[PDB]
Amino acid sequence: SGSMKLSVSLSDDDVAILDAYVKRAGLPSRSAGLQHAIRVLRY
Amino acid sequence: SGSMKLSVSLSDDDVAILDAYVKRAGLPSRSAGLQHAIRVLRY
């Protein structure tokens, strides 16, 4: 039960993909996108 | 080189996992880690 407000630098290209993925999958925010992203990087 | 800066609230476990991947791949920053993740989502 912890949260870190963080800053990340993504390419103009990266964020455009992230935004597209987030809105496409119907994610509440970029955070939720990162949840999926972290999951695939962990395993 | 000239990218965007996103402020995201990420969970404690998630950032810890990201940091694990970042050091694993010898990445320069957390950004490079998420760029890989964003890219693996789109391929």
UniProtKB/Swiss-Prot annotation, chains A, B:
Signal peptide: none annotated. Induction: Mildy induced (5-fold) when grown in a non-replicating state. GO terms for biological process: detoxification; positive regulation of growth; regulation of DNA-templated transcription. Keywords: Toxin-antitoxin system. The keyword RNA-binding does not apply. Forms a complex with cognate toxin MazF9. The chain holds residues 1 to 40 of 76 of the full protein. This is Antitoxin MazE9. It comes from the Bacteria. The keyword Transmembrane helix does not apply. GO terms for molecular function: toxin sequestering activity.
